[PDB]
């Protein structure tokens, strides 16, 4: 199963291995049982290069996990501005709420993130 390997490669930040797996036909929209996609993992861990290559090949920008969190929620929590910018360009839902009622904008205020509040 190439989907499991892709998720594992995305988490470890292995850019080359991610491309090799995708070239072999790995699903960019692969999930674990909790609905975590390669994009979720890449966004949380700050892998800008992998985020861009996933979105390029049609990965769901608004996919939410078991807690209703999109890649935009996870990027906002860590505070990676560059990934946030790329996600918004692919049509990330700025008004998307997790199952706890918070938006990407709501998380940025919680952290006290100055630069992220104006982009969102």
């Amino acid at each position: 199963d190439l989907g499991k390997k892709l998720l594992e490669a995305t988490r470890a930040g292995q850019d080359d291995e991610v491309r090799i797996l995708m070239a072999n036909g790995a699903d960019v929209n692969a999930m674990d049982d909790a609905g975590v996609t390669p994009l979720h993992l890449a966004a949380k861990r700050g892998h800008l290069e992998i985020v861009e290559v996933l979105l390029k090949h049609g990965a769901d920008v608004n996919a939410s996990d078991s807690w209703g969190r999109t890649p935009l929620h996870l990027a906002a929590t860590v505070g990676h501005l560059e990934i946030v910018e790329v996600l918004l360009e692919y049509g990330a839902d700025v008004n998307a709420q997790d199952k706890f009622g918070k938006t990407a904008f709501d998380i940025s205020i919680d952290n006290g993130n100055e630069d992220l509040a104006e982009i969102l």
Partner: protein
């Protein structure tokens, strides 16, 4: 007597609602492996001599309507009733493909005074769905 009478001509109905795919606006993820559950349940309950009916990807309106129609059938010659729900959920809520259905609403159709041909008979509701977002971290054992 301490046991339900189960020697009616028929064992009863087994209604399986199998929701796999959901509307984008709802934000609910596709429920992988639920088709395996549905097939496994059909095999099990049909071997128990139940009349199995499987319904895929029903909206909230379609669920309420299915449950109303089934409750208005003649069950007088059936021993019991089984309904299996495979979808997303919250507390007291099962999800159609397009949004929430009140669980009490579905089951109320089968109340002793509203479905007379099932009075005094076991009515079994098997619910595979979330009841919230809490996660159990567990504790170490032997």
């Amino acid at each position: 007597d301490n046991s339900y009478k189960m020697d009616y001509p028929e064992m009863g109905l087994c209604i399986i609602i199998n929701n796999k795919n959901f509307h984008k606006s709802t934000g609910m993820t596709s429920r992988s492996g639920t088709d395996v559950d549905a097939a496994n349940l059909r095999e099990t309950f049909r071997n128990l001599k139940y009349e199995v009916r499987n319904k895929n990807d029903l909206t909230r309106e379609e669920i309420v309507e299915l449950m109303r129609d089934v409750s208005k059938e003649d069950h007088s010659k059936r021993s019991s009733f089984v309904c299996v729900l495979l979808s997303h959920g919250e507390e007291g809520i099962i999800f159609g493909t397009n949004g929430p259905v009140d669980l009490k609403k579905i089951t109320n159709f089968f109340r002793g005074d509203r479905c007379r041909s099932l009075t005094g008979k076991p009515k079994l509701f098997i619910i595979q769905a979330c009841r919230g977002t809490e996660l159990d971290c567990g504790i170490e054992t032997d």
